[PDB]
């Protein structure tokens, strides 16, 4: 009665959302973008190599200076590199060897990391004594810390394997907000240019737009046939791309509340590990589990190029705030800068 009427209300509101989306599905991005001149072939060259990691590199994140970058590795270490000079600005040994993510703060003073420890350890580079000291252990998540991005020196969002995200205040060490609603491990997240919104991708093969301010799920996007491993915003902040284990990437627009584009090819069979946009957003850089890192035209959806500079899975990748270079960490224990 109450549960069957509420289930049929659920399954009616669902087709109301499907019809509200199909109504806006008048033309596809591939039609509108047919006319613009092709981007060509992205012949890329390996500019730098970052040696020093002893095992798989799991994550990395550029600083707002576009010169420093963190990288977490299976060897239990979190190294901060100066991309320009190849010198290791820091080689931080971690308390937990099972690190999976890292996040350079926009201020550059703080860095965050985490993993199966279910804790987001925040470190301060500018310490009173100049050491690499642990500022905070943001504990409370009931699953492995899957990803996190600094909002500021004192606030940080983290996703976890408890199927939830959470905003923390580093000062109090307490979950300011908790973003529940996902039905699978949250693999990735991405803060919008306006810090008031962020999207997150999970193993439920769906993405969700969250409001940092309030703490509610605003929109939910579907279409992936497998877990979403990585997610990030289109530079403008009204769209975002998701990489999935279905061997396809997808673009989602927030205002249209549906998928715009798919990036896939019959040759590509392995899942996607990472994604990033160019400063303009015209280029989507997707990391793969075939030692490659393919470059897609975000508008044409054609495979513009291929980055093959690793012997193992291209686990992680990023782009600088100025779009000047592409970093790619990999399981082969080496990161690589590209231009």
């Amino acid at each position: 009665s109450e549960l069957d009427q509420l289930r049929q209300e659920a399954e009616q509101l669902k087709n109301q959302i499907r019809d509200a989306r199909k109504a806006c599905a008048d033309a596809t991005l591939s039609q509108i973008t047919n006319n613009i001149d092709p981007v060509g072939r992205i012949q890329m060259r390996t500019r730098r190599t970052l040696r020093g990691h002893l095992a798989k590199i799991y994550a990395m994140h550029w600083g707002t200076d576009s010169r420093l970058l963190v990288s977490a590795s299976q060897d239990g270490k979190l190294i901060i590199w100066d991309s320009y000079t190849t010198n290791k600005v820091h080689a931080i040994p971690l308390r937990s060897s099972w690190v999976m993510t890292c996040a350079y703060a926009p201020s550059g003073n703080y860095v965050a990391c985490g993993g199966l420890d279910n804790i987001c350890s925040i470190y301060n580079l500018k310490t009173r004594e100049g050491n690499v000291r642990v500022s905070r252990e943001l504990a409370g998540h009931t699953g492995y810390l899957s990803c996190c991005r600094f909002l500021d020196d004192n606030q940080i969002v983290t996703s976890s394997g408890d199927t939830t995200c959470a905003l923390w205040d580093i000062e109090t060490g307490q979950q300011t907000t908790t973003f529940t609603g996902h039905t699978g491990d949250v693999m990735s997240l991405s803060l919008a240019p306006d810090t008031r919104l962020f999207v997150s991708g999970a193993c439920d093969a769906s993405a969700k737009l969250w409001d940092v301010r309030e703490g509610m799920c605003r929109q939910t996007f579907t279409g992936h046939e497998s877990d979403i491993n990585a997610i990030c915003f289109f530079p403008n902040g009204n769209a975002f791309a998701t990489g999935s284990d279905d061997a396809t990437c997808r673009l989602f627009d927030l205002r249209a509340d549906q998928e715009l584009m798919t990036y896939s090819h019959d040759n590509i069979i392995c899942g996607i590990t990472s994604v990033s946009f160019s400063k303009s957003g015209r280029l989507l850089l997707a990391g793969y589990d075939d030692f490659n890192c393919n470059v897609w035209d975000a508008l044409k959806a054609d495979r513009a190029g291929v980055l093959a500079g690793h012997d193992n899975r291209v686990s992680c990748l990023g782009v600088t705030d100025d779009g000047m270079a592409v970093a790619t960490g990999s399981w082969d224990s080496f990161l690589k800068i590209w231009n």
Binding site: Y58, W98, M100, Y144, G161, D185, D245, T273
Partner: peptide, 13 residues
């Protein structure tokens, strides 16, 4: 054995 008990971990790890 640690990675055998990881699943999604052993995928990303």
């Amino acid at each position: 054995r640690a990675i055998k008990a990881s699943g999604p971990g052993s995928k990303r790890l």
